[PDB]
Write a protein that binds this ligand. Structure first.
Ligand code: AQ4
Length: 312
């Protein structure tokens, strides 16, 4: 009693796309930047191409195809979608280019120009994407700022489905196996029982929210992954970001309750952050909150311009 997944997997000819520059060569393969030019039409589509290292890997090959399967099965404005695959020596995933890269690095190199309206709209958008995934019965499993891409400063989307698992109809949770999950973003029950749920994703959503409000800080900067379970067992949690009103911080804290059902639901996070988005400054206190444009390059507020200083 399960719905057939009639998603279309598109096989694209390598001749149809012109690679142009590598965006990153991490410990997973490489991500390129290019243009997809379908033979028939008269359109040039900016795309990102992801593949593995030159030599063929056994299990890594299955993993790209697993990731292709999930990306080809989601269609939402706040989720990254697969345009298709190109069967070369190694399989290549092709998706829409998110020009401004990942959100984490984005908040880092733009701290001095990120106003409360942008922060709150991203929380709404990320919550919408996640609620969609929940409707599709998909449990992310690696939600974090690094996995949210920026199409434009006003439009972000969730990505990286490398660990995503689709749950059955009467299936409530996923039981994992190997240890390859980032500890500092996982629910307590995940670390203790390898259990994952939509509610487990909410915990990660909370942490993701923390990264944004702190403009890109590393959660538990000191503490090493091994200790995280214990500090969490003692009831410790991430600190209140300086720009955070208690209203916002209470949202992050709720996503971190021990009882998973006590945490909010993505559909509720959307409503909550949406209300706050209508009146940004009542919820986040940021020094500039616009732009913060005559570079003094000094620490002085008794400065007065010469054409305002008259005959003494
Ligand atoms: C298929 C697939 C797939 C799966 C997971 C992740 C991505 N990533 C991306 N997809 C689309 N556009 C990207 C653009 C990027 O530009 C970043 C710098 O911004 C000026 C970018 O940065 C790569 C990491 O090094 C910075 C990643 C992009 C693609």
């Amino acid at each position: 009693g399960e719905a057939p997944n009639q998603a279309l997997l598109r096989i694209l000819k390598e001749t149809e796309f012109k690679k142009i520059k590598v965006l990153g060569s991490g410990a997973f393969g490489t991500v390129y930047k290019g243009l997809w030019i379908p033979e028939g039409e008269k359109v040039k589509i900016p795309v990102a191409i992801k593949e593995l290292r030159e030599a063929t890997s056994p299990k890594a090959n299955k993993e790209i195809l697993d990731e292709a399967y999930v990306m080809a099965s989601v269609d939402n404005p706040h989720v990254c979608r697969l345009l298709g695959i190109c069967l070369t020596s190694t399989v290549q995933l092709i998706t829409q280019l998110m020009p401004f890269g990942c959100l984490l690095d984005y908040v880092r190199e733009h701290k001095d120009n990120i106003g409360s309206q942008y922060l709150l709209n991203w929380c709404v958008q990320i919550a919408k994407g996640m609620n969609y995934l929940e409707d599709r019965r998909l449990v992310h499993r690696d939600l974090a700022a690094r996995n949210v891409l920026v199409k434009t400063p006003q439009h972000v989307k969730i990505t990286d489905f490398g660990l995503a698992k689709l749950l059955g109809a009467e299936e409530k949770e996923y039981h994992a196996e190997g240890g390859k999950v980032p500890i500092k973003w996982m629910a307590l029950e995940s670390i203790l029982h390898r259990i994952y749920t939509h509610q487990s994703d909410v915990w990660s959503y909370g942490v993701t929210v923390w990264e944004l409000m702190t403009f890109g800080s590393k959660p538990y900067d000191g503490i090493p992954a091994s200790e995280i379970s214990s500090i969490l067992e003692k009831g410790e949690r991430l600190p209140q970001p300086p720009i955070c009103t208690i209203d916002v911080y209470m949202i992050m804290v709720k996503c971190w309750m021990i009882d998973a059902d006590s945490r909010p639901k993505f559909r509720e996070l959307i409503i909550e952050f949406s209300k706050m988005a209508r009146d940004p400054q009542r919820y986040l206190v940021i020094q500039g909150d616009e732009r913060m444009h005559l570079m003094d390059e000094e620490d002085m507020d008794d400065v007065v311009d010469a054409d305002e200083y008259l005959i003494p």
